[PDB]
Design an enzyme around this catalytic site. Sequence first.
Site, short mmCIF file in Angstrom:
data_model
loop_
_atom_site.label_atom_id
_atom_site.label_comp_id
_atom_site.label_asym_id
_atom_site.label_seq_id
_atom_site.Cartn_x
_atom_site.Cartn_y
_atom_site.Cartn_z
N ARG A 169 0.84 -1.19 0.00
CA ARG A 169 0.00 0.00 0.00
C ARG A 169 0.88 1.24 0.00
O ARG A 169 0.87 2.02 0.95
CB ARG A 169 -0.92 0.00 1.22
CG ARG A 169 -1.98 -1.10 1.19
CD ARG A 169 -2.76 -1.18 2.51
NE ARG A 169 -1.88 -1.42 3.66
CZ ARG A 169 -1.36 -2.60 3.98
NH1 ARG A 169 -1.62 -3.68 3.24
NH2 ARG A 169 -0.56 -2.71 5.03
N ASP B 286 2.07 -8.84 6.45
CA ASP B 286 1.01 -8.02 5.88
C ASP B 286 -0.15 -8.73 5.20
O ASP B 286 -0.68 -8.24 4.21
CB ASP B 286 1.62 -7.02 4.90
CG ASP B 286 0.69 -5.88 4.58
OD1 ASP B 286 0.44 -5.64 3.38
OD2 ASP B 286 0.21 -5.22 5.52
N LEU C 85 1.04 -20.94 0.01
CA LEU C 85 1.61 -22.00 0.83
C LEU C 85 1.36 -21.72 2.31
O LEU C 85 1.38 -22.64 3.13
CB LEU C 85 3.12 -22.12 0.58
CG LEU C 85 3.55 -22.86 -0.69
CD1 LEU C 85 5.03 -22.67 -0.92
CD2 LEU C 85 3.21 -24.32 -0.57
N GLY C 86 1.15 -20.46 2.65
CA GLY C 86 0.92 -20.12 4.05
C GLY C 86 -0.53 -20.08 4.47
O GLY C 86 -0.85 -19.60 5.56
C1 HEM Z 1 -5.05 -14.17 4.79
C2 HEM Z 1 -3.73 -14.45 4.45
C3 HEM Z 1 -3.18 -14.63 3.18
C4 HEM Z 1 -3.73 -14.42 1.93
C5 HEM Z 1 -5.13 -13.94 1.57
C6 HEM Z 1 -2.71 -14.84 0.96
C7 HEM Z 1 -2.88 -14.79 -0.42
C8 HEM Z 1 -1.93 -15.22 -1.33
C9 HEM Z 1 -2.13 -15.17 -2.75
C10 HEM Z 1 -3.38 -14.62 -3.41
C11 HEM Z 1 -1.03 -15.73 -3.33
C12 HEM Z 1 -0.76 -15.93 -4.82
C13 HEM Z 1 -0.13 -14.71 -5.45
C14 HEM Z 1 0.04 -14.84 -6.96
O1 HEM Z 1 -0.50 -15.81 -7.54
O2 HEM Z 1 0.70 -13.97 -7.56
C15 HEM Z 1 -0.14 -16.11 -2.26
C16 HEM Z 1 1.10 -16.70 -2.44
C17 HEM Z 1 1.96 -17.08 -1.40
N1 HEM Z 1 1.70 -16.93 -0.04
FE1 HEM Z 1 0.05 -16.21 0.79
N2 HEM Z 1 -1.56 -15.33 1.60
C18 HEM Z 1 -1.83 -15.17 2.96
C19 HEM Z 1 -0.91 -15.48 3.97
C20 HEM Z 1 0.41 -15.93 3.79
C21 HEM Z 1 1.35 -16.22 4.87
C22 HEM Z 1 1.03 -16.20 6.37
C23 HEM Z 1 2.53 -16.59 4.30
C24 HEM Z 1 3.68 -16.97 4.99
C25 HEM Z 1 4.74 -16.06 5.17
C26 HEM Z 1 2.31 -16.58 2.85
C27 HEM Z 1 3.17 -17.19 1.94
C28 HEM Z 1 2.86 -17.39 0.60
C29 HEM Z 1 3.81 -17.90 -0.36
C30 HEM Z 1 5.13 -18.61 -0.05
C31 HEM Z 1 3.28 -17.67 -1.59
C32 HEM Z 1 3.94 -17.96 -2.93
C33 HEM Z 1 3.56 -19.32 -3.49
C34 HEM Z 1 4.08 -19.53 -4.91
O3 HEM Z 1 4.31 -18.52 -5.62
O4 HEM Z 1 4.25 -20.70 -5.31
N3 HEM Z 1 1.00 -16.18 2.55
N4 HEM Z 1 -0.70 -15.79 -1.02
#
Ligand code: HEM
Length: 405
Positions: free
Chosen positions: A177, A242, A349-350
């Site tokens: 943001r 975030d 993954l998270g």
């Molecule tokens: C309400 C919480 C969360 C939401 C809504 C969320 C949403 C997302 C979304 C939409 C993507 C895909 C982005 C894309 O396709 O360009 C993503 C990827 C990812 N998220 Fe989350 N996320 C959340 C929490 C977290 C947390 C807690 C972590 C851990 C630090 C995290 C780690 C990841 C990782 C490692 C990816 C990359 C996976 C890949 O590219 O193969 N996320 N997240």
Amino acid sequence: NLAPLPPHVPEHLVFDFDMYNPSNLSAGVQEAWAVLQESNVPDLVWTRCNGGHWIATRGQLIREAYEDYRHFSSECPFIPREAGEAYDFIPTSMDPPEQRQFRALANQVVGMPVVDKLENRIQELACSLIESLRPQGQCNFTEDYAEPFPIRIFMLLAGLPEEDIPHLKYLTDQMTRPDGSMTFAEAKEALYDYLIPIIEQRRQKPGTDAISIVANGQVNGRPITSDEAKRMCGLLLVGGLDTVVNFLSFSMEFLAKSPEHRQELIERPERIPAACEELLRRFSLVADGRILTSDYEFHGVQLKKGDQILLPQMLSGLDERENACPMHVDFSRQKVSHTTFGHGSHLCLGQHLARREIIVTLKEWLTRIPDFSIAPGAQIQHKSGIVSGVQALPLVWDPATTKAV
Ligand code: HEM
């Protein structure tokens, strides 16, 4: 500030939506974005704001684009282009089959088994934070719980000091943001300036923390490079600091306004998991995109190589063609459809960690403070961006109605 319309864009497909400052923001951020789904708006539009880019407004199109990495590449996932270009986080900035190897390693640090092992810690902190607030009869949820709870858990998993939170948090927020205080490139440099020394250390004297694990991981038989580890930890930082933080506030803001939904969860706890999914749908908050690798006709529209397209993960579940009465929160929906955690090869993954933190919060909060509301006179303000959030959330309640556990 609108950018001149490119030659290949039909003017009837123009709809100037600013993802960083939507028009109906006062009505709520999700409501502000939902204007893109009004009958007068085509399924695929072009906005002249933020440099000019396409925006898919329907769940069907968003899912299709996310599945087709051949035409829609992750190389440049952020808008504006400058941001998408300076963006080099792994594995999000990579397309398969390359992405797969790094994704496997990242899953090692935030996957299910890790969540299982941290469960007691998550529960202890949630209970500890809430019990400490309970007798006060008021708090700013965003800074008193939404931020400390998920962030401290992440710092614990990453083995980083709590003193660096204010610094790290500011840098992260600038990426999702943008304040205007610094460019994406500069914010990224700063974040990397922080990580570099740490990874160096963790490479020589490895620990059991997530960073130590990433820094000494193996990718494609060979060892990960310092640069690669740096770019992966950068993503882990943004996700841990975030995402859950902002989601909790949207949810709590809603629960504070709907006694009926609170009661429902208190009387029928077996519904919490379902309620979690429904809230994840209604208060979805992420919106990033892809870049066209070549000229391509998508659903009758001609896209040109280099064109960026925003595929709002937040819009899928708000699409009425996907969910009836999308703005209505209904814990007993027969089918909750959304792409809040993404779609395609880049599925979050998270999300397991996130769901655990959300469910524990709902259960533990409603147990001790079943009755609460938004402070009289307070005006809740949302902020839009790659990840949307809540400025502040002043809550109040009668301590006499709380329950010590
Ligand atoms: C309400 C919480 C969360 C939401 C809504 C969320 C949403 C997302 C979304 C939409 C993507 C895909 C982005 C894309 O396709 O360009 C993503 C990827 C990812 N998220 Fe989350 N996320 C959340 C929490 C977290 C947390 C807690 C972590 C851990 C630090 C995290 C780690 C990841 C990782 C490692 C990816 C990359 C996976 C890949 O590219 O193969 N996320 N997240």
